[PDB]
């Protein structure tokens, strides 16, 4: 049963002409669907409606072709075709009693317009600090009236599509905020200078939107109350609160954020730098002056933290984005008191990384069904029950193995999960011990809690940890109907890397002066004062080890053959990571790799050291002048972060002895996770989820087709339009 | 009439069971359409069919979901939905008497599979040097059988879709090439080691494909004959020629390329580094040992060069990619002797940049209709004729103005083009003088030639160059019905940049020790020994000026606040550009910007120097510890490359005096190109082309809507499929 203190989270709240059934609200957030993947958009938002979320919003929605985010994917409300596609979502959300909202967006020069090729307009002409090759035209008075009209027209179409909430989006340094912020606005007319002038564009837009649909829709506004850059941009207790007082009568609800667009990781705080409720100091400042309902995200996943901000008067509604992705049923679980069933977001920002890359669908480290609801028909809380009594043996309890176990158990199968390690988690148990990555353990905490609970529902199922390594013979004679090999991967020990695909002469982690990430994390092998980290991986390992070692007093130099922490650009961790490494005095040697290693020293070269001119010089000779940039650098300890390899020996033996499977009544053996190929934790988790869901298919090793959301030639996107080629002659 | 020497280019040639009408062949190349935008795919390929190209191929076509290039866009032939969408293209191409081909693709770990989430397979397990986080599973004998089956099934689907040519794609280091290349293949079984073993996967696949559709389709193979890395990978005279001898009897035509995937700019040679026919030394080696028709791209635009390679026996067919994008009608023009009407490709690779970015449609610097054929109905050789006699005045003869003039003239309007410059071309005249950019002048050569020719067709039209600057009074009294302001943009003189959007204290290009790009190119102002280039632009200007100054003996240091030459990663110029800067001893100071400038010295700081921890400290105080990395560096001359701004003074005056337009019989004035907002040359050209095409619309300043190719909710991509949400429970 639910704890009485949590009752407040279930009181309804009035926002203009609408009523939220409870205080759980999904703020606008990208998922890689927009108006292009209507099924994905509707399924993803509707399961949350079913899960109890009071209101579900689309991601930023473009009001006009001149605010086109291509290559990134945004929603669009340009014409009737968009109204049709988006309605699929509002209809499905209404089905479960929730409200639907749309975030009206105009990006100024931040929108690159790679599809439309149109010219974006802004308060002053500037080149975006985010999209550095994108410039806008300074708006004259008629430009202003025209863009304001775009908002009105968009709001109208939104009502036609069935939206209950319409936002005038002024966060992440988009249009309304550009007029308000002196960083962008250099105008000297009535739209620049003083706060009243700078606030004018926003105030007029709100008034016009409210006039157009205010009687049928709640008018909300998203506001970046502080750009977190100090004086020079927006400060909460200067322009921030004053703007709120000015616009308060026009808005039905305030949705607050902090930060800009270049560093919106300040808003979507990664667990690496920010804890739950990190935004509170800024958000509370708004309630202090507003008379309207206020909400402000802060990666809220804990009901105790939720009631605290509400009772303390910091906010009236609990806005979430990531917590809703990780667990679409969070509100229901809280309502029913099923706290231990909550799948807590680990703040990894991998969901965000997909949006940032531009084009691919969202994925989630915790929830393997995110993005799969529509195309694969995977509901996060409903599983097809087996009609047979097959038992399954799973070797390996890491992200992939533990998820496969969990899903199979939920499906009614008898499961035997084994590992040599003492706890569920696999490599994730080491990774969560890296500086700042503590919350990533929730991934294994959740599976541990769930597997334990599920064991009680089937006494034939078993959890065997701290065991001796399973061997081919052990597996063949275990007596299980099907076997899942989820043995993982290990970091390369011989220098093997993506640049050469070959070992590096002299690399050997068994030597006393060389180490792998595993040896560093175990903390047994001695590490000298001067450390060089040789890197060929673009994610978190090298930067994280650098931080760990530097804080421990070592002198660290990273020699990187690939762009250091490239993937961190997408997870929004990059800016603060570079700052952290800088304050720790970590030296970076980019554009360099290693040709050979000796005890205490290694030979490095610039990767752009070969001659620029290509000349055919016949066989045996390189077509460019030789790279002569080689130089030696010394080290006390060399840490190798060159790549990973699948630990698939067990699998290889089983495959070699496949003729014996039948004799032992083994119907099939499958390879998943890192053992199949080193993946991101999210995908490792996904492979486990997939073989479990498809264990009864013809070949569970390979995925069955998913529904594709691509246009069918012959069908025009514009209702009643002509799909045929028509030249204007 | 056509020069007789060029008759050979129009002789037919037999390829297996098919016959090519002439020697003009469009090899496979991406356009950002794939199987997702059937209209774009069919229109772009068919206009070339109408233009006389003998065969048109799709871009790389995925044979199965486990070879998914998302975020990049490829064609796909996975199911019936794809067959339907791709048939639109083959039908349309056949309608004009040309053949249609498809390039069957499986990419190994090079395909990141961000949409499918499937696991790629390869000869050995490796992390792609291109997609550094993407690993594949080592294939066992059943894996090999299954992948070869994918090819067979895709080939059968291709025939159903109406393709005449089917490729087994083995270039750009994709699957077949991975088995052949020791760099990837570390196998020790019958598929690795010796050449016969390394060639086995390709030979077997060719054989099975030929067996499945060889009687109905010509079987072609695209092969990267030399990886241009020297010993270690594929070398033309070693494994190259021998594999050709081995596979010769199986193929109907050889399509040859050089280079890998990480550096395919070696194939798609940028004019900055390679001239027309740059691949000859390698391509000719294949003809030397083959008994089948051979073709090898080399940015062929000149018919004289085309006959040279054919008569000298270097190739039998003229394969083109970029040349066909710049001019879909190149074949017809050569056939009719209209040599001066050929729109020559400048080898800028901006078309390619769009594919590389991932998701956006292709655009062309020379051909503003590329990508616009279907959605806007713009035919590159057909223009709607005007029914009135309006005269249009165009101020500025750069890429935008000259293109607007060309299109209006082709449409029958009376045009008056004027500029203060002595020649057509605007800023492009200075740009084409930078080291290696000489071929970019073809953009202005083409327009100079066409305008000159079009003047003869209407004696009222006029070209006035070398004139005094047009003033507002001059424009008002000129007597034109409509005016187009195309006055361009200039580089900032006060340090204004995308990072701060403000001037830099002490920046002033009128000072003796500071210069702008224009001042450097004019060659008048003196430049001292030690040069510092302050950059905040991500394209070619800073690197090009650095090269120019270094070769002239100056000591150059580039202080860059953004990723130096970032956009060049996309144009494939980056690798050779960095090697060039390295040879020239150009020092790079990335992740640094400038706070203030003094005579002979400037203060720089690390952009990541602020504290990593964010703490709310109230208004007036920055939430992070202060950046204290500031230090001073000296210079003899400082070159400012911080950004551009529109030169729109004339426009501003005309708009201020808008009440005077009517009395002067001016129906409208429009702002285009860089003067509206600094753009890439391709987009500047596009704005001119667009106002010209839409001069009669209600508001020519803003583009009319284009046909959108997005799915319509309610229509399944799979014929007969179910579009509704269906959960598997
Ligand atoms: C995948 C993703 C994409 C985002 N896209 C948007 C967007 O379209 N519009 C917007 O206003 N905010 C966007 N956000 C920001 C979120 O609305 C939110 O402010 C941020 O994730 C912090 O909320 P949380 O801590 O509850 O996740 C995005 C966040 C996520 C997780
Ligand atoms: C826009 C573009 C995309 C390309 N995509 C492909 C592709 O899908 N498949 C392929 O085999 N080659 C691709 N290429 C390579 C071209 O086929 C060709 O080898 C290269 O551009 C050199 O030919 P050219 O010099 O005539 O342009 C691409 C080139 C271009 C221009
Ligand atoms: N032969 C074996 N018997 C039992 N457990 C094994 C065996 N080989 C490996 N393991 C375990 O398999 C697990 C693999 O987990 P992990 O590396 O996290 O992979 P993934 O990310 O694919 O889940 C590890 O906990 C490892 O101890
Ligand atoms: N007042 C003016 N009268 C005539 N020509 C002008 C005037 N101001 C600028 N121009 C010319 O306009 C042209 C702008 O060209 P450019 O910078 O190449 O722009 P775009 O790239 O937009 O075509 C330059 O050739 C410049 O000399
Ligand atoms: S991908 Fe990570 S940050 Fe995003 S919702 Fe999932 S667990 Fe949270
Ligand atoms: S964009 Fe450039 S390289 Fe490409 S076809 Fe056009 S002119 Fe040629």
From Swiss-Prot, chains A, B:
S-6-FMN cysteine: residues carrying this PTM: 30
Xref: InterPro entries: Aldolase_TIM, FAD/NAD-bd_sf, NADH:flavin_oxidoreductase, OxRdtase_FMN_N, TMADH/DMDH/HD_second_a-b, TMADH/DMDH_FMN-bd
Keywords for the protein's UniProt record, in alphabetical order: 4Fe-4S, Flavoprotein, FMN, Iron, Iron-sulfur, Metal-binding, Oxidoreductase
Enzyme class: oxidoreductase
Cofactor(s) the protein requires to work: FMN; [4Fe-4S] cluster
Binding residue positions for ADP: 400, 419-420, 427, 470, 674
Transmembrane segments: none
UniProt-annotated binding residues for substrate: 169-172
Cofactor note: Binds 1 FMN covalently per subunit. Binds 1 [4Fe-4S] cluster per subunit.
Binding site residues for [4Fe-4S] cluster: 345, 348, 351, 364
Domain of life of the organism encoding this protein: Bacteria
Reactions catalysed: trimethylamine + oxidized [electron-transfer flavoprotein] + H2O + H(+) = dimethylamine + reduced [electron-transfer flavoprotein] + formaldehyde
CDD domains in UniProt: TMADH_HD_FMN (cd02929)
Entry similarity comment: In the N-terminal section; belongs to the NADH:flavin oxidoreductase/NADH oxidase family.
PANTHER family cross-referenced by the UniProt entry: 2,4-DIENOYL-COA REDUCTASE (PTHR42917), 2,4-DIENOYL-COA REDUCTASE [(2E)-ENOYL-COA-PRODUCING] (PTHR42917:SF2)
Assembly and oligomerization: Homodimer. Forms a ternary complex with the heterodimeric electron transfer flavoprotein.
Protein name as catalogued: Trimethylamine dehydrogenase
Organism: Methylophilus methylotrophus (Bacterium W3A1)
